[PDB]
Design a protein around this ligand. Structure first.
Ligand code: 19M
Length: 263
């Protein structure tokens, strides 16, 4: 009963990818919370379990399919299904462990990895950092096959973790940031895979901090500027929510919106 959004890497175009990312965002946000014109994801506090997850069904040219589960509170990929097996990252807490029991309920082989799903852990397992892992339609196509074959020994753990890293950035990070969506559009349009540059990496690393800075801002003004990087690695200071409107698509819930003290 959780919502399902479909995407295939087979014959993918900028438009089909765009449609996909827009649909994911539509299922993540409720319209209940928008601040400085930027939507906020649902608050985990009091969120009914029946509204907690969405499903992303990925298919490829190889005619394989896998289903990712995303937590609506943070767009986080919490696990996946391939045929008769489902795999979940190690939960951060009891409440999350219980919540994932509500996913892929009729799968006959349920596994919970002993490792969590954050980039740091996955990069260690992968033997490579994000900055050295190519993204694009080709990597996603290959990632889907890798996830599919894991249960039968065909996929090494390093290649699984690498494949997770690809999926997370092309789905979850793209949903969070129009900027990253745009980066993926480019790669898809020209069918040219490439690793993420510093502008992409710093945005991913800063999502929580940007979310908090905006929500705690004084009428949009940050108390403390945040440093990001442009493509060439050079510094870019963010002082205000204004410059982020075309860059960030969704925020994680960090605080309550203050009473809108009007003039
Ligand atoms: N499986 C998976 N799905 C994702 O969507 C995902 N998305 C992001 C990351 C990831 O490590 N991000 C690196 C990072 O620095 N994250 C920031 C911002 C953030 C990103 C995603 C979600 C929440 C916050 C952060 O505060 N990370 C936390 C750790 C954390 C907490 C909750 C969820 C993921 C990571 C920290 O450094 O303290 N890992 C993911 N893993």
């Amino acid at each position: 009963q959780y919502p399902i959004i479909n995407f295939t890497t087979a014959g993918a175009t900028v438009q089909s990818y765009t449609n996909f990312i827009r649909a994911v965002r539509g299922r993540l946000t409720t319209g209940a919370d928008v601040r400085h014109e930027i939507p906020v994801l649902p608050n985990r506090v009091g969120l009914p379990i029946n509204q907690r997850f969405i499903l992303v069904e990925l298919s490829n040219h190889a005619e394989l399919s896998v289903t990712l589960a995303l937590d609506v509170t943070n767009a986080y990929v919490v696990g996946y299904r391939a045929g008769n097996s489902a795999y979940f990252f190690h939960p951060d807490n009891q409440e999350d462990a219980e919540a994932i029991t509500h996913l892929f309920t009729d799968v006959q082989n349920r596994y919970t990895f002993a490792f969590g799903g954050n980039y740091d852990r996955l990069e260690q397992l992968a033997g490579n950092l994000r900055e050295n892992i190519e993204l694009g339609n080709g990597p996603l196509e290959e990632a889907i096959s890798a996830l599919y074959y894991y249960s039968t020994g065909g996929t090494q753990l390093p290649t699984l973790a690498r494949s997770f890293i690809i999926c997370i950035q092309m789905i979850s990070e793209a949903a969070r940031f129009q900027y990253i969506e745009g980066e993926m559009r480019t790669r898809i349009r020209y069918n040219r895979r490439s690793a993420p540059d510093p502008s992409v990496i710093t945005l991913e690393n800063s999502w929580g901090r940007l979310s908090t800075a905006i929500q705690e801002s004084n009428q949009g003004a940050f108390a403390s500027p945040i440093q990001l990087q442009r493509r060439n690695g050079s510094k870019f200071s963010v002082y205000d929510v204004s410059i982020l409107i075309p860059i960030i698509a969704l925020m994680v819930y960090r605080c309550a919106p203050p009473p809108s003290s009007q003039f």
